[PDB]
């Protein structure tokens, strides 16, 4: 049964969650710049949301950074799938223009990564998650005790449980007849780790073709 404490936390997260424009070799560069700058906005958003998650700011700053550095791509991918339009097969960022598999590729992304983005968003969208549910997958994604360089693994794992339990209780209210919606939501976290690794190959590709990520994205993503 959803506890008062789980109720309040779930509304806190929901409340918590609630640029070079898009046009030759300069054409390519100002699409990439628009795209990588959209990410810079997401990473600023993730950092702000994360600071409002019970338990987060009580972790060592070093552990906070450990958590946000590796989980950002995964959270960017969840957010992305919230914005999937199943009719147009597009993702609408900023609330104006919507982007499709070739807009992504004109913006510099290799098809080996775009296809999984959209196939993951097609799958996420089939579950029809609402805000509260995305907010809590995002919390669980962040509190992963198995990230490189987490120190207090025990407390990150404890924090994650409180959210996993919150989601359990909530989904039993949202979906009282389908006991499988909860683990279907969790299992989508399995796929995200593969997309996180598909993304590392992307970033390394950008190294090979000597493409330069901006300061915040090079910081969290480049292998220095």
């Amino acid at each position: 049964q959803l506890s008062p404490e789980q109720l309040g936390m779930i509304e806190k997260l929901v409340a918590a969650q609630q640029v070079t424009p898009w046009p030759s070799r300069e054409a390519r560069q100002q699409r990439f710049a628009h795209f990588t700058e959209l990410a810079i906005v997401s990473v600023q958003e993730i950092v702000d949301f994360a600071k409002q998650l019970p338990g987060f700011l009580q972790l060592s700053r070093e552990d906070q950074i450990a958590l946000l550095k590796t989980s950002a791509i995964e959270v960017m991918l969840l957010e992305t799938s919230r914005r999937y339009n199943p009719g147009s097969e597009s993702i609408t960022f900023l609330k104006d223009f919507s982007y499709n598999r070739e807009d992504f590729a004109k913006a510099g992304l290799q098809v080996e990564f775009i296809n999984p983005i959209f196939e993951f968003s097609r799958a996420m969208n089939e579950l029809q998650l609402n805000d509260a549910e995305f907010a809590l997958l995002i919390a669980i994604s962040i509190f992963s005790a198995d990230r490189p360089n987490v120190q207090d693994q025990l407390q990150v794992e404890r924090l994650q449980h409180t959210y996993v339990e919150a989601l359990h209780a909530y989904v039993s209210i949202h979906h009282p007849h389908d006991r499988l919606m909860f683990p279907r939501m969790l299992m989508k976290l399995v796929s995200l780790r593969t997309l996180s690794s598909v993304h590392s190959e992307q970033v390394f590709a950008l190294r090979l073709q000597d493409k330069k990520l901006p300061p915040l994205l090079s910081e969290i993503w480049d292998v220095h």
Binding site: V47, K51, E62, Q64, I65, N149
Partner: peptide, 15 residues
Amino acid sequence: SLTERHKILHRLLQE
């Protein structure tokens, strides 16, 4: 530390 190698993210967590 991760903190000295992540100065932009750190400042964001600070502000």
